[PDB]
Amino acid sequence: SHMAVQIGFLLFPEVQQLDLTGPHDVLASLPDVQVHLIWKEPGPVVASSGLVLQATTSFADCPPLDVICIPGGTGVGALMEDPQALAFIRQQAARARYVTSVCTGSLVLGAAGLLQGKRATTHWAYHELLAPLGAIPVHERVVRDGNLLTGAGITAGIDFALTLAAELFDAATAQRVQLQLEYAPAPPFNAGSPDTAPASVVQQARQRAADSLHKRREITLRAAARLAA
Amino acid sequence: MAVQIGFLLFPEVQQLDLTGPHDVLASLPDVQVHLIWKEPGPVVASSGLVLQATTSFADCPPLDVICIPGGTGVGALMEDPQALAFIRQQAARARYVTSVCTGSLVLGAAGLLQGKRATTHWAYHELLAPLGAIPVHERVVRDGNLLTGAGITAGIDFALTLAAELFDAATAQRVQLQLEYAPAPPFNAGSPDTAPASVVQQARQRAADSLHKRREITLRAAARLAA
């Protein structure tokens, strides 16, 4: 309808698609929501896995949003230094009811200056990069600070989206969607946190992510310097 | 030698049934993931999200794993002889025949649940027995080379289970940690066992028209298998 809640996700090359698609299917289950996938121009955008998604609107044509949500992925490093994307995020966050992200999408909110003095979370492996962007780093799944909601790594998007659903509507509506999605998780292993995974597994992961972390630390401090100027 | 994993992508799919498992499985070493429909190109999910089929039925390579997701669109597939014939073709030489949520109703219409333990979405579970399944109220059910997951988000638990079978526990744990899959749901309403009675009533009231239409499709599909 013309009175729909307007929810927008940034869709960028090398996005981690589950950061977007998990929340999308949760929030699209709510009454009279319109969901936008936003990029520089409408058309195909390839996620890090090779899954092809389709941007529905340009930055220029996007209506004022009630909710803006930034997903994460390999592609966030480019976004943290993309003045056109950062200007769009700041413009929308001026009037949004909720300013949100999942996983390393909070590093993009950070680069836009929107985490200064705010409680935030991100993916466990990149959590150290929050403080240089002015955030108060919080080790929880879903972190609220006023109208800022951030989710932790990838699958946290589902917990984030149900939290946001209860804020947009009410607990009863969020619980109905939880039941429709049969979201009573029973993971076959207990390796979803660095605190509970086998130490051999946590060490293999930190080994893998090391080169990405050092690269993103330099991008993070260049982004922080621009906020300081 | 690459593990070939194929998802059936159909109009009015419930996209998270596909995209959850896709991001888990595409994280594994030496896999190639296909999104299969009658022709390559755009397929629109039930939410309006546009996905892209990568291959036609004809160009689909022999699959190690076939996976059928669920959604509004399964009713049409349950009476689509091309789709059912294609699923039987691939199930014949696939190492694993798999589904998530109401995708198991499509396996059932194809004749592939006869005498097997299986699950599906809690609201549709009564439709498994007429398609010949032994219905099991568990979130991921394995019967030989058949694995079925329960409703929508069960796809993530299913995919981690399958990852350990294709590779090993250590490989599945690495992917679990990369995905930070340590869920902390903000409510306890994910099961009809634990949700408030008012929430269960409303979820059943919403599903009722779909369930009635699927009771009718199910009994036509069962009568075809019998004849």
Side-chain angles (χ1 to χ4, degrees), chain A residues 7 9 11 20-21 23-30 33-38 43 52-57, chain B residues 9-16 19 42-52 70-73:
Chain A
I7 300 178
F9 292 88
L11 171 61
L20 186 159
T21 64
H24 191 289
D25 233 4
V26 176
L27 298 172
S29 298
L30 296 172
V33 158
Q34 187 173 353
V35 186
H36 304 269
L37 303 184
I38 307 144
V52 179
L53 295 168
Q54 172 91 356
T56 64
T57 186
Chain B
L9 167 58
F10 53 85
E12 311 294 342
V13 65
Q14 184 81 59
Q15 59 87 2
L16 189 47
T19 61
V43 170
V44 186
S46 65
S47 63
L49 187 77
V50 181
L51 296 172
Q52 175 94 5
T72 298

Side-chain angles (χ1 to χ4, degrees), chain A residues 16-22 24-25 28 37 48-49 51-54 122-124 141 152-156 158-159 162-163 166 171-172 174-176 178-194 197-198 201-202 204-205 208, chain B residues 14-20 22-23 26 35 46-47 49-52 120-122 139 150-154 156-157 160-161 164 169-170 172-174 176-192 195-196 199-200 202-203 206:
Chain A
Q16 188 75 58
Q17 61 87 0
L18 191 49
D19 295 9
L20 186 159
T21 64
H24 191 289
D25 233 4
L37 303 184
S48 66
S49 66
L51 186 84
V52 179
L53 295 168
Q54 172 91 356
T122 192
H123 192 279
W124 67 264
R141 193 92 177 131
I154 309 183
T155 60
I158 299 167
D159 294 328
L162 286 169
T163 302
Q175 287 171 311
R176 177 183 52 80
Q178 186 186 11
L179 181 57
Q180 290 181 335
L181 305 201
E182 201 166 346
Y183 186 53
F189 307 100
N190 193 36
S193 153
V201 172
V202 178
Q204 281 291 133
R208 275 178 190 254
Chain B
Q14 184 81 59
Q15 59 87 2
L16 189 47
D17 295 9
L18 186 158
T19 61
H22 188 289
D23 234 5
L35 302 177
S46 65
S47 63
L49 187 77
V50 181
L51 296 172
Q52 175 94 5
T120 195
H121 190 281
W122 67 268
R139 185 176 185 75
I152 306 178
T153 59
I156 302 166
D157 293 331
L160 285 168
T161 303
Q173 289 169 326
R174 182 169 50 75
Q176 188 184 12
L177 180 60
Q178 287 175 348
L179 266 57
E180 200 167 349
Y181 182 56
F187 308 99
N188 193 29
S191 165
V199 173
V200 177
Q202 291 179 306
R206 284 181 184 262

Side-chain angles (χ1 to χ4, degrees), chain A residues 43-129:
Chain A
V45 178
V46 182
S48 66
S49 66
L51 186 84
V52 179
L53 295 168
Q54 172 91 356
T56 64
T57 186
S58 65
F59 295 143
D61 297 326
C62 186
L65 297 171
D66 293 278
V67 179
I68 188 170
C69 184
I70 317 303
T74 295
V76 299
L79 270 193
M80 289 176 74
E81 305 194 280
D82 182 334
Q84 183 183 17
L86 297 178
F88 178 77
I89 295 171
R90 281 193 302 267
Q91 185 192 343
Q92 285 286 352
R95 291 181 168 85
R97 294 173 52 204
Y98 296 97
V99 173
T100 74
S101 64
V102 176
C103 196
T104 52
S106 53
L107 302 183
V108 183
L109 292 180
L114 296 172
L115 297 188
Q116 296 184 268
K118 305 296 186 180
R119 302 200 307 125
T121 194
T122 192
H123 192 279
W124 67 264
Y126 296 101
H127 214 273
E128 65 193 77
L129 298 180

Side-chain angles (χ1 to χ4, degrees), chain B residues 9-66:
Chain B
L9 167 58
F10 53 85
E12 311 294 342
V13 65
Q14 184 81 59
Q15 59 87 2
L16 189 47
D17 295 9
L18 186 158
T19 61
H22 188 289
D23 234 5
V24 183
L25 297 169
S27 298
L28 296 167
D30 306 315
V31 310
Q32 303 183 270
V33 186
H34 307 277
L35 302 177
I36 308 153
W37 189 233
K38 292 188 182 185
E39 62 192 70
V43 170
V44 186
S46 65
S47 63
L49 187 77
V50 181
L51 296 172
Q52 175 94 5
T54 63
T55 188
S56 64
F57 291 173
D59 291 334
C60 187
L63 296 175
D64 289 288
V65 178
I66 187 163

Side-chain angles (χ1 to χ4, degrees), chain B residues 104-105 107-108 111-120 125-136 143 146 148 225:
Chain B
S104 55
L105 303 182
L107 293 180
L112 297 172
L113 300 187
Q114 292 294 323
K116 302 269 266 186
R117 294 162 66 253
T119 195
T120 195
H125 213 275
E126 69 178 77
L127 299 180
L128 290 171
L131 296 170
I134 306 164
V136 174
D143 190 335
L146 177 71
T148 60
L225 294 175

